[PDB]
Design a protein around this ligand. Structure first.
Ligand SMILES: OC[C@H]1O[C@@H](O[C@@H]2[C@H](O)[C@@H](O)[C@H](O[C@@H]3[C@H](O)[C@@H](O)[C@H](O)O[C@@H]3CO)O[C@@H]2CO)[C@H](O)[C@@H](O)[C@H]1O
Ligand SMILES: OC[C@H]1O[C@@H](O[C@@H]2[C@H](O)[C@@H](O)[C@H](O)O[C@@H]2CO)[C@H](O)[C@@H](O)[C@H]1O
Ligand SMILES: [Ca+2]
Length: 386
C-alpha cells in the first residue's frame, strides 16, 4: 500500500546511500535480518535489491579503553570498516569512508582528539592525521574495496581532532584531503557540516573554507527534519554553496521515525515534544520524509549528487521488557549507542547516558529485522508508485 510521488528532475546516477555502521556489533549480538519473502538474508544484499547504491561507514581511531573494552556505538574502527566495505563492494555498492578523527562520536559538541594524539603538538597531529588516513585507505584498497568518497571529518561545525581554530582545522582538512588525493584521483573528498537552519552558517563556513584554500569536492550536510528547519532552506543554502564555490553538495545523514514506540527499552532520540514533525510518525510518513530530502537535494540542480539515510537498521537486540538482559548485550558487544566503558573518554555525555539504540524507531526494518515498506522509497523516487 506504500505510495511515493516521483521526484521530478532526479538524475539517473543520483547517490542513494545508507550508513549501517552498527551492523557488525548487532550481528555479533545475535540480531538477524530478513528480506521481503521472510528468509534470513545478508542485509547488504537486501539493500542492493532495494536500490541502494552506496554505503557510508563511520571510523573511529581507537574506540576502546586500555583493556580493549569497546566504547560501543558499534565499536567502529578501521577493521569493521573493512568488513563492511568488502560486503558493500561484494554487493555492487560504492563506499563512503567517514573518518571522525576521534576515538568516539564526533558532532557539533564533541570533536575530541584521539587518545593517541592527546598530547602531540599541532604539527605532529596533522601529519599523524594525514598518515592515518593514508594507511587506512590503503588497507581498504588492498581489501579490494571500491571506495567512491571520503568524509574528512564528521559534523565539524566547531572543531576537529581537538582543534577549534578554523585556520588549524583547515590545515587538518587539507592533511586529510591530501591522503585521499594521493590514494585515488577519482575519490570525491567531502566535508560534513550540520544545522543548515542557522542563519548564514553554511555561507560563512564555505567562504572560510575558500579563504583557507581547503581542497575538497563535496560540501555535505546532515538533515534531520526534527531540528534542522525547512526543506526550502536546505535547498537554498546548499545551492548557494554550489553556485558560489563550484562544489557538489549532498545530504550525508537523514532519517525519520516510522513509529513512536521504543523497541529496546533505551529511550529514543525522536519523536519528542518540541521537535518539528511535518510527517505522520508512520511507515508512509517516514517514506515521504526520505522522498522529500531527495527532492530537495535534486532541486539544487547539477551539483546535488545524493542522500545517505543514517542508520536504517539499528534495531533492538531484544524487546523493551528485557531491558536488563539487553544491557548485558550492549555492554559486551557495543551494539548500543555507547557502553559504560566510554565514560573515560566522554564522561559528560556517554558517561551518563550509555545504553542501547536511540534510533530503533527510525530504521527501515522493523524490530525483528523484516524490511518495512518504506525501504522501497529508494526505487520508487525514480518512477513513483505504480
Ligand atoms: O535515551 C533517551 C535520552 O537520549 C539522550 O541522547 C543521548 C546522548 O545525549 C546523545 O548525544 C547521543 O547521541 C549519539 C551521538 O552522540 C550523536 O552524535 C549521534 O548523532 O546519535 C547518537 C545516538 O544515536 O544519544 C544518547 C542516547 O541515550 C538525549 O539527550 C536525552 O534527552 C534522551 O532523549
Ligand atoms: O548527535 C546529535 C545531533 O546534534 C545536532 O546539533 C545539536 C544542536 O541541534 C545544535 O543546535 C548544537 O549547536 O549542537 C548540538 C550537538 O550537541 C546536529 O545538528 C545534528 O545533525 C546531530 O548531530
Ligand atoms: Ca531504543
Amino acid at each position: 500500500g506504500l505510495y511515493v510521488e516521483k521526484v521530478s528532475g532526479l538524475r539517473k546516477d543520483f547517490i542513494k546511500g545508507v550508513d549501517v555502521s552498527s551492523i557488525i556489533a548487532l550481528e555479533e549480538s545475535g540480531v538477524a535480518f530478513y528480506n521481503e519473502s521472510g528468509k534470513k538474508q545478508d542485509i547488504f544484499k537486501t539493500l542492493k535489491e532495494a536500490g541502494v547504491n552506496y554505503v557510508r561507514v563511520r571510523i573511529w581511531n581507537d574506540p576502546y579503553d586500555a583493556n580493549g573494552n569497546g566504547y560501543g556505538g558499534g565499536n567502529n574502527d578501521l577493521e569493521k570498516a573493512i568488513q563492511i566495505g568488502k560486503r558493500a563492494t561484494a554487493n555492487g555498492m560504492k563506499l563512503l569512508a567517514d573518518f571522525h578523527y576521534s576515538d568516539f562520536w564526533a558532532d557539533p559538541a564533541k570533536q575530541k582528539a584521539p587518545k593517541a594524539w592527546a598530547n602531540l603538538n599541532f604539527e605532529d597531529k596533522k601529519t599523524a592525521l594525514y598518515q592515518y588516513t593514508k594507511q587506512s585507505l590503503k588497507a581498504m584498497k588492498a581489501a579490494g574495496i571500491d571506495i567512491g568518497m571520503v568524509q574528512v571529518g564528521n559534523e565539524t561545525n566547531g572543531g576537529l581532532a581537538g582543534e577549534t581554530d578554523w585556520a588549524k582545522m583547515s590545515q587538518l582538512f587539507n592533511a586529510g584531503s591530501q591522503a585521499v588525493r594521493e590514494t585515488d584521483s577519482n575519490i570525491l573528498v567531502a566535508l560534513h557540516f550540520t544545522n543548515p537552519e542557522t542563519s548564514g552558517r553554511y555561507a560563512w563556513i564555505a567562504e572560510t573554507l575558500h579563504r583557507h584554500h581547503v581542497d575538497y569536492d563535496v560540501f555535505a550536510s546532515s538533515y534531520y527534519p526534527f531540528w534542522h528547519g525547512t526543506l526550502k532552506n536546505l535547498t537554498s543554502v546548499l545551492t548557494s554553496v554550489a553556485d558560489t564555490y563550484g562544489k557538489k553538495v549532498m545530504v550525508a545523514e537523514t532519517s525519520y521515525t516510522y513509529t513512536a514506540e521504543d523497541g529496546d527499552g533505551h529511550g529514543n532520540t525522536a519523536p519528542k515534544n518540541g521537535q518539528t514533525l511535518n510527517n505522520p510518525v508512520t511507515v508512509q510518513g517516514q517514506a515521504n520524509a526520505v522522498r522529500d530530502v531527495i527532492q530537495a537535494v535534486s532541486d539544487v540542480g547539477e551539483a546535488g549528487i545524493g542522500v545517505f539515510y543514517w542508520e536504517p537498521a539499528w534495531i533492538p537486540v531484544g524487546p523493551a521488557h528485557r531491558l536488563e538482559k539487553n544491557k548485558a548485550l550492549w555492554e559486551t558487544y557495543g551494539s548500543g549507542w555507547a557502553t559504560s566503558y566510554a565514560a573515560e573518554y566522554d564522561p559528560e555525555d556517554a558517561g551518563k547516558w550509555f545504553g542501547g539504540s536511540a534510533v530503533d524507531n527510525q530504521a527501515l526494518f522493523d524490530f525483528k529485522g523484516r524490511p518495512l515498506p518504506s525501504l522501497h522509497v529508494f526505487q520508487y523516487v525514480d518512477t513513483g508508485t505504480p
